[PDB]
Design an enzyme around this catalytic site. Structure first.
Site, mmCIF file in Angstrom:
data_model
loop_
_atom_site.group_PDB
_atom_site.id
_atom_site.type_symbol
_atom_site.label_atom_id
_atom_site.label_comp_id
_atom_site.label_asym_id
_atom_site.label_seq_id
_atom_site.Cartn_x
_atom_site.Cartn_y
_atom_site.Cartn_z
ATOM 1 N N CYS A 31 -19.277 -31.253 28.398
ATOM 2 C CA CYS A 31 -19.432 -31.498 26.980
ATOM 3 C C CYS A 31 -18.108 -31.991 26.414
ATOM 4 O O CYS A 31 -17.133 -31.246 26.349
ATOM 5 C CB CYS A 31 -19.957 -30.228 26.283
ATOM 6 S SG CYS A 31 -19.598 -30.038 24.512
ATOM 7 N N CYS A 34 -16.807 -30.139 23.109
ATOM 8 C CA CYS A 34 -16.306 -28.816 23.535
ATOM 9 C C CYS A 34 -14.835 -28.908 23.965
ATOM 10 O O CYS A 34 -13.981 -28.117 23.531
ATOM 11 C CB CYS A 34 -17.133 -28.272 24.709
ATOM 12 S SG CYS A 34 -18.886 -28.090 24.388
#
Length: 107
Positions: A31, A34
């Protein structure tokens, strides 16, 4: 250093039975956003010393916890106070935006 690296089995002690606020970050390695917020969380762990702890749970390495909180999109930041979720933030955000999320919900 100041961040709790959580697991599925350590979730209860670390988050649920803690005497205060815990900003939990539900995230994964693939991700992009993230990873973007990770250096920001380091900064928050340092700056919010004594007001809250930051805790991270990788949703792949620890697959059990996130379904319990209805997590879909990541990163998801849940602000826990004494084991109960007070505030929810989904997706990436700046340091300045995170501060506003925290300052508003910590009261």
């Amino acid at each position: 250093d100041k961040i709790i690296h959580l697991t599925d089995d350590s979730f209860e002690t670390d988050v649920l039975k803690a005497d205060g606020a815990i900003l939990v970050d539900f995230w994964a390695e693939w991700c992009g956003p993230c990873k973007m917020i990770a250096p920001i969380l380091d900064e928050i762990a340092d700056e919010y010393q004594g007001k809250l702890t930051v805790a991270k749970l990788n949703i792949d390495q620890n697959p059990g916890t996130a379904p319990k909180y209805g997590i879909r999109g990541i990163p998801t930041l849940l602000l826990f106070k004494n084991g109960e979720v007070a505030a929810t933030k989904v997706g990436a955000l700046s340091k300045g935006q995170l501060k506003e999320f925290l300052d508003a919900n910590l009261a």
